[PDB]
Design a protein around this ligand. Structure first.
Ligand SMILES: *[C@@H]1O[C@H](CO)[C@@H](O)[C@H](O)[C@H]1NC(C)=O
Lengths: 121, 107, 241, 106, 42
């Protein structure tokens, strides 16, 4: 219902760009500070992305990287396009609905898998 | 000239002579009776009987304990011909004439 | 003048207005066929039309219509707590019709906002409008904004495209208090006719009685109201009108 | 700063006072969340901001823990309580969870 | 006595005026506070 279609990722040589059309599903999403997270396969999820309804399109300070977030206020979903991938990006990307303390990063999409490998299974 | 208003509650706007004014204050009502006449004898009010008529009923409802008169000339410095009485609870005996008017009384 | 008159302010800076003595009658209003809500906590207007308060106050602002419910004593939410809180003893009534009609600004109605991100919980009747960057986390805010820190006011962007739930209603907060001095507005005061020469009951400015009213050749001073006789009985009335 | 939980792999049986430690060094009890991941499912909003347990998630997860060593206390381990917990430090650039505190039903 | 072991009921909200000792007044009206004589429809 309140869902985030993690979409736009794919198999990737760990040097080029990628995308995450984490499309806001069932969301009147023009009021929240939608953040994003990154889970190394078989580990826990560390917060990376954080768009702001007030503005402030930004990220993990430890990961203030080229990968660039935005919300297509037209389509009303957060972008987090995976530009110029490197090895350290190797994980899985998600997105979430957050408020800080009013609420926190609450509503999560299913999963967005970055296959940051040349090899196909 | 001397008016410094703040958080104001409510407002209302409406020799030769003597001037008299009572200023009772009961039931949250600063009743003010008044009347006035001339005085050939500049010096003092001649022993003549009169009777002030009710003039206002302001619902100010404020605990007062103190008054002060206000006069002026032109330029004195902002320091940094009358005579008042004092009321007391009494018992009086008034006389009304035909038209209905306090003619005289017995204290 | 303090009701059906122009625009207002954002509810986070909800305004106040004091009301005088001028008699009044809700019921003249109550049936104005405009009050989409007259949710009336104190008493029914058809009953308080004569109710006298030393003070009556009006607040008015532009908000998303929905907030009406939040303007019930016993309400929460970022607005009912971060933009205004009524008391749970609000002797008054929630008057409101609609803003979207005159507030749409089809290209997104701004002009009104709300301290979404306020710190304190609204004390009843708090007029506080102090804007501030509260700590969404613990990054020492003191201005810092962008993570674990943001400012309080957000956009009450009302559009005709977005639904009435997300469209604004013009909203009024009524509130009155009667202390212990001589109170102000005192409901209504009816008026019969001067039925004369026949035995009738009468109520002349509170002077009640029964008798036959005729014309007199008497005349007294312009400030007296009624005349008595030697035995302290009323026998003359200056028709209050 | 990195937190860490006590029973990394807590092989408890259901109906037990399961309780996960969370010792910090920057003391952000002005937050300190606590989420349970089901594998194959992004974990959501268990606990956050001091102890305010977002509901639907039962009150058995009796939230607690302040200072630097925080501690969520699950009342009862239960057949639906086989998953991986994450006490989430926040309020700074470290908005991070636990090191995947696993609790194993038995 | 206060018996909250079994404490549907109902009473009334609005009406003409209180009755005289020992009278019953079951009813289903509107006693409209405005002229609207809503007849069957609220
Ligand atoms: C009383 O009334 C009469 C006639 O109305 C008038 O001539 C007279 O001056 C008034 N005052 C008195 C008698 O003091």
């Amino acid at each position: 219902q309140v869902q985030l279609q993690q979409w736009g990722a794919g198999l990737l040589k760990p040097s080029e760009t990628l995308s995450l059309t984490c499309a806001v599903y069932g969301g009147s999403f023009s009021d929240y500070f939608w953040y994003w997270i990154r889970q190394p396969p078989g580990k826990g999820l560390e917060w990376i992305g954080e768009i702001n309804h007030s503005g402030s399109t930004n990220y993990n300070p430890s990961l203030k990287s080229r990968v660039s977030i935005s919300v297509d206020t037209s389509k009303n979903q957060f972008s987090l396009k995976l530009s110029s991938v490197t090895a350290a990006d190797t994980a899985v990307y998600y997105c979430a609905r957050g408020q800080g303390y009013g609420r926190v990063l609450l509503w999560f999409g299913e999963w967005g898998q970055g296959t940051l490998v040349t090899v196909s299974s | 000239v001397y008016s410094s208003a703040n958080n104001c509650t409510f407002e209302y706007v409406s020799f030769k002579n003597l001037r008299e004014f009572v200023f009772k204050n009961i039931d949250g009502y600063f009743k003010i009776y008044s009347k006035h006449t001339p005085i050939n004898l500049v010096r003092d009010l001649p022993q003549g009987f009169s009777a002030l008529e009710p003039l206002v009923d302001l619902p100010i409802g404020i605990n007062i304990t103190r008054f002060q008169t206000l006069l002026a000339l032109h330029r004195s410095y902002l320091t940094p011909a009358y005579y008042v009485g004092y009321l007391q609870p009494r018992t009086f005996l008034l006389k009304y004439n035909e038209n209905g008017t306090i003619t005289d009384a017995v204290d | 003048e303090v009701f059906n008159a122009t625009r207002f302010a954002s509810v986070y800076a909800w305004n106040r207005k004091r009301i005088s003595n001028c008699v009044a009658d809700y019921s003249v209003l109550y049936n104005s066929a405009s009050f989409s809500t007259f949710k009336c906590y104190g008493v029914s207007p058809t009953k308080l039309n004569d109710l006298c308060f030393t003070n009556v106050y009006a607040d008015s602002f532009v908000i998303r219509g929905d907030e009406v419910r939040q303007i019930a004593p016993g309400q929460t939410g970022k607005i009912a707590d971060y933009n205004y809180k009524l008391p749970d003893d609000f002797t008054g009534c929630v008057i409101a019709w609609n803003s979207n009609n005159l507030d749409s600004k089809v290209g997104g109605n701004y002009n009104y906002l709300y301290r979404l991100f306020r710190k304190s919980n609204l004390k009843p009747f708090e007029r506080d409008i102090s804007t501030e960057i509260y700590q969404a986390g613990s990054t020492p805010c003191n201005g810092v904004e962008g993570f674990n820190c943001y400012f309080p006011l957000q956009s009450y962007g009302f559009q005709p495209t977005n639904g009435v739930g997300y469209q604004p209603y013009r909203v009024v907060v009524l509130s009155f208090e009667l202390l212990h001095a001589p109170a102000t507005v005192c409901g209504p005061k009816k008026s019969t006719n001067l039925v004369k020469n026949k035995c009738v009951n009468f109520n002349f400015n509170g002077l009640t009685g029964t008798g036959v009213l005729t014309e007199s050749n008497k005349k007294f001073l312009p400030f007296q109201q009624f005349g008595r006789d030697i035995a302290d009985t009323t026998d003359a009335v200056r028709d209050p009108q | 700063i990195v937190l860490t939980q006590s029973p990394a792999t807590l092989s408890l049986s259901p109906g037990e006072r399961a309780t996960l430690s969370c010792r910090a060094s920057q003391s952000v009890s002005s937050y300190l969340a606590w989420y349970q991941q089901k594998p194959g499912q992004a974990p959501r909003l268990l606990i956050y901001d001091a102890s305010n347990r977002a509901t639907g998630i039962p009150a058995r997860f009796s939230g607690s823990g302040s200072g630097t060593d925080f501690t969520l206390t699950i009342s009862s381990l239960e057949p639906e309580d086989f998953a991986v917990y994450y006490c989430q430090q926040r309020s700074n650039w470290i908005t991070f969870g636990q090191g995947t505190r696993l609790e194993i039903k038995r």
